Design a binder for this molecule. Structure first.
Ligand SMILES: *[C@@H]1O[C@H](CO)[C@@H](O[C@@H]2O[C@H](CO)[C@@H](O[C@@H]3O[C@H](CO[C@H]4O[C@H](CO)[C@@H](O)[C@H](O)[C@@H]4O)[C@@H](O)[C@H](O[C@H]4O[C@H](CO)[C@@H](O)[C@H](O)[C@@H]4O)[C@@H]3O)[C@H](O)[C@H]2NC(C)=O)[C@H](O)[C@H]1NC(C)=O
Ligand SMILES: *[C@@H]1O[C@H](CO)[C@@H](O)[C@H](O[C@@H]2O[C@H](CO)[C@@H](O)[C@H](O)[C@H]2NC(C)=O)[C@H]1NC(C)=O
Ligand code: NAG
Ligand code: NAG
Ligand code: A2G
Ligand code: A2G
Ligand code: A2G
Ligand code: A2G
Ligand code: CA
Ligand code: CA
Ligand code: CA
Ligand code: CA
Ligand code: CA
Ligand code: CA
Ligand code: CA
Lengths: 142, 141, 310, 105
């Protein structure tokens, strides 16, 4: 909803944010004493939830600035994945491929909404076949 | 900051309040590190303090590229591959004198092909017209 | 003849509406419109579109410097926000409510008394500086300040100028809104403003839960961390590496690089089934495309990003 | 559909590059904008020395009003030429580098 992307670093030990175009870089947590080895990350409302291989726990942090991330289910192994399960975490929109598979012979894959002259999808082909000149029909690769 | 213990013991109680051990380098407000990672070639520090302005000590078993960026093993000097970024490892290497072969090698009389010296007088005609098994070849028993 | 400019010039046909001030009176682009940018391009205040690759390349490509607005962080150009002050020892700014409150807030103690450097939290400067709105104590002395909505003018440090507090990092859970009024937030459809600032989710949705891998098994827990349920235990010495979920079909997808397989289960359990079992030797991560019902996955034995059906 | 010596080589080098038909089709529509920038820059390049002689002629006349008025137009005209100078050079470097990388392997 803010059009931002959050990523974590296991080597420089930070959590940082940029806009969908890479502008306006900001740091939400950094230092070996706070985020020694983050692996996974997810967010909901104002919180970022990340897993760290060094503290071996899922952590909670403010999405803006965290002085000391709080613990969440400390574990005896490397926590490998985290994601928040909620309806607002998957907003609601119309798929261009809903209209009779977008006319694609085999596979219909989304794209940027402006792409393909505003259709917002391109036809893709399975392994055994290739896309023809009309970029709609799939023929066997030779 | 790395879980080398596989139990997180080595990174416990490592708050920002403290110092590095005598045998460690310090990254500015990031981590302590092994001195082995100082001038290893790549920046471990957040601000690259570990790789800041230090110079290479390439050994006799290695060759230093002309640009002084990095050193490579002596085996890769004059091999036909540009291991150095500036192609300095293949610059100034030996060649055969024109139309001829190294002081080492043997030359085919048929077509001027250079062959290894051992392939003169080893029983097998390794040359197009048998130049390397001439009548002057003393045989073996 | 040609396009007669606002002040009588023979401007070329192609010059009008090319995102540029060509007319002498700045009227060569007013009467038209420009097409919007494709997803492979980025915006400027000129109405222009520029290549995605030019953004944060370091080049002032579009007059605003807008494609270079803060490509870097924790940096020298602080120009700190209202009710903030900078301790000279480092590139750090601290709020006035912390500065000289009696406890070191800059980690170096650079916001409290330092007799060794001959610095004390003084207040005498306000007597001659004559602050416009208020004064506060700093190691330098009495520092002038002005209310939220405004920042201290840099010419004199005695006046204060109108401000866009929508810029403060931590302003809002979505956007500043209700502007011309100084600042507060607004939240999108499905959110309500608890307390102000907080975009709390609507009661109309099911309780938010966090699903995660504790290292070997898939676990589920609420946001407050009061309950923890094991959703699916790994078989044959497996390992749950990357998890993701589809809400409408209420399914959870996770990868197992030790078993070299991808699994899918119902949120309440049951209906557990393998999704991929060939060329999936190391499925490092996972992400579902809920709008088109697709499963983007990352494979690291042969480095690629694949797409499959659910 | 090209005239500029710089653009003509780039199109020739583009046809021997790694460009996909879609990439090559979009590449032509970028060269058309690139040429328009060059011709706009070339047009103002003539105007800079034209107004430079106009400013020199007026400075010889000695009228303070005409000298001030022509100078006000001149320094803004110089900015127009100088800013387009980089607009064209930056676009030239990106186009040349992209076709260089597409041909380098
Ligand atoms: C994307 O679009 C889909 C489809 O429109 C949305 O799905 C709807 O979401 C709303 C909001 O939660 C749901 O509304 C709720 O429905 C409940 C019952 O519906 C379920 O069960 C019936 C059968 O009994 C099914 O037909 C239906 O599909 C559902 O499975 C009600 O119990 C809820 O009301 C209860 O709570 C409120 C307070 O919150 C009380 O006031 C009520 O008295 C009651 O106790 C509520 O009405 C709706 O059912 C969903 N439909 C479907 C098809 O899923 C997505 O939410 C939407 N996503 C977004 C964010 O846009
Ligand atoms: C992969 O998973 C699909 C289910 O989505 C499964 O049908 C594939 O084949 C099954 O593999 C089982 C284990 O090898 C085998 O016992 C079973 O008979 C077989 N089912 C059919 C009808 O093909 C799975 N493939 C593999 C090799 O695991
Ligand atoms: C190694 O190279 C360094 C470069 O700084 C030089 O100062 C030093 O004398 C050399 N000898 C050794 C082995 O230290
Ligand atoms: C005073 O500060 C303003 C910004 O608030 C600045 O634009 C201006 O140039 C400065 N100088 C004067 C004397 O106005
Ligand atoms: C610095 O911290 C280290 C942590 O290993 C040791 O405690 C060391 O004794 C400290 N040195 C000083 C001078 O405080
Ligand atoms: C290669 O070495 C020979 C000596 O054997 C000559 O120096 C020759 O000039 C060298 N080759 C080149 C390209 O200069
Ligand atoms: C052949 O080699 C053998 C090795 O034992 C003997 O030296 C023998 O005398 C050789 N023959 C000739 C003719 O020299
Ligand atoms: C703006 O123009 C672009 C050109 O790629 C697209 O057509 C886009 O969809 C347009 N904007 C809107 C809001 O539709
Ligand atoms: Ca680390
Ligand atoms: Ca290093
Ligand atoms: Ca070599
Ligand atoms: Ca021989
Ligand atoms: Ca114009
Ligand atoms: Ca740029
Ligand atoms: Ca304080």
């Amino acid at each position: 909803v803010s059009k931002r992307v959050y990523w974590v670093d296991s080597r420089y030990d930070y959590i940082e944010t940029v806009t969908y175009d890479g502008i306006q870089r900001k740091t939400v947590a950094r230092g070996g004493s706070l985020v020694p080895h983050p692996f996974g990350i997810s967010l909901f409302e104002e919180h970022v939830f990340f897993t760290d291989w060094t503290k071996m726990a899922v952590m909670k942090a403010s999405k803006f600035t965290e002085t000391n991330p709080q613990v969440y289910h400390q574990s005896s192994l490397r926590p490998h994945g985290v994601t928040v399960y909620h309806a607002l975490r998957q907003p609601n929109a119309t798929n261009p491929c809903g209209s009779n598979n977008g006319g694609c012979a085999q596979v219909c894959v989304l794209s940027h909404r402006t792409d393909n002259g505003g259709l917002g999808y391109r036809c893709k082909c399975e392994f055994g076949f290739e896309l023809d000149d009309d970029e709609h029909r799939c023929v066997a690769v030779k | 900051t790395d879980n080398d213990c596989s139990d997180g013991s080595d990174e416990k109680n490592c708050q920002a309040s403290g110092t590095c051990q005598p045998t460690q380098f310090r990254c500015p407000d990031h981590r302590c590190i092994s001195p082995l990672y100082v001038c290893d070639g790549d920046k471990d520090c957040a601000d690259g303090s570990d790789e800041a302005g230090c110079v290479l000590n390439c050994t006799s078993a290695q060759f230093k590229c002309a640009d002084g960026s990095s050193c490579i093993n002596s085996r890769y000097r004059c091999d036909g591959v540009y291991d150095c970024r500036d192609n300095s490892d293949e610059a100034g290497c030996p060649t055969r004198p024109p139309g001829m072969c190294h002081l080492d090698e043997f030359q085919c009389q048929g077509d001027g092909t250079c062959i290894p010296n051992t392939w003169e007088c080893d029983g097998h005609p390794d040359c197009i017209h048998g130049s390397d098994e001439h009548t002057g070849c003393v045989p073996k028993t | 003849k040609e396009f007669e400019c606002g002040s009588g010039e023979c401007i070329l046909r192609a010059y009008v509406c090319d995102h540029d001030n060509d007319c002498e009176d700045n009227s060569d682009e007013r009467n038209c419109n420009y097409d919007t940018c494709g997803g492979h391009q980025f915006t400027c205040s000129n109405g222009q579109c520029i290549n995605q690759n030019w953004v944060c390349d370091g080049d002032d490509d579009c007059q605003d410097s807008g494609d270079e607005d803060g490509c870097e962080s924790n940096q020298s150009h602080h120009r700190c926000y209202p009710r903030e002050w900078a301790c000279p020892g480092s590139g750090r700014c601290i709020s006035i409510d912390k500065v000289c409150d009696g406890v070191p807030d800059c980690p170096e103690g650079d916001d409290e008394n330092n007799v060794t450097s001959g610095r004390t939290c003084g207040m005498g400067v306000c007597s001659v500086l004559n602050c416009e709105y208020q004064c506060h104590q700093t190691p330098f002395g009495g520092e002038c300040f002005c209310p939220p909505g405004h920042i201290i003018n840099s010419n004199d440090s005695r006046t204060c100028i109108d401000f866009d507090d929508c810029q403060i990092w931590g302003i809002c859970d979505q956007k500043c809104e209700n502007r011309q009024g100084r600042h507060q937030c607004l939240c999108e459809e499905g959110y309500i403003l608890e307390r102000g600032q907080h975009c709390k989710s609507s009661d109309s949705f099911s309780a938010a839960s966090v699903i995660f891998s504790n290292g070997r098994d898939l676990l589920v827990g609420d946001l407050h961390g009061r309950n923890f349920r094991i959703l699916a235990e790994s078989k044959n010495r497996g390992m749950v590496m990357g998890v993701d979920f589809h809400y409408q079909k209420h399914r959870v997808f996770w990868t197992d690089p030790m078993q070299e397989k991808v699994f899918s289960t119902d949120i309440n359990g049951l209906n557990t089934q393998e999704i991929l079992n060939v060329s999936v030797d190391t499925p490092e991560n996972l992400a579902v495309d809920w709008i088109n019902n697709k499963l983007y996955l990352v494979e690291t034995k042969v480095n690629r990003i694949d797409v499959v059906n659910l | 559909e090209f005239e500029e010596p710089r653009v003509i080589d780039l199109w020739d080098l583009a046809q021997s590059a790694n460009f996909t038909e879609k990439e090559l089709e979009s590449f032509r529509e970028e060269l058309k904008h690139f040429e328009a920038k060059i011709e706009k820059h070339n047009h103002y390049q003539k105007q800079l020395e034209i107004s430079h002689q106009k400013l020199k002629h007026v400075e010889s006349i000695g009228d303070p009003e005409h000298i001030s008025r022509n100078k006000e137009k001149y320094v803004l005209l110089e900015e127009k030429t100088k800013e387009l100078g980089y607009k064209v050079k930056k676009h030239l470097q990106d186009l040349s580098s992209r076709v260089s990388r597409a041909r380098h392997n």
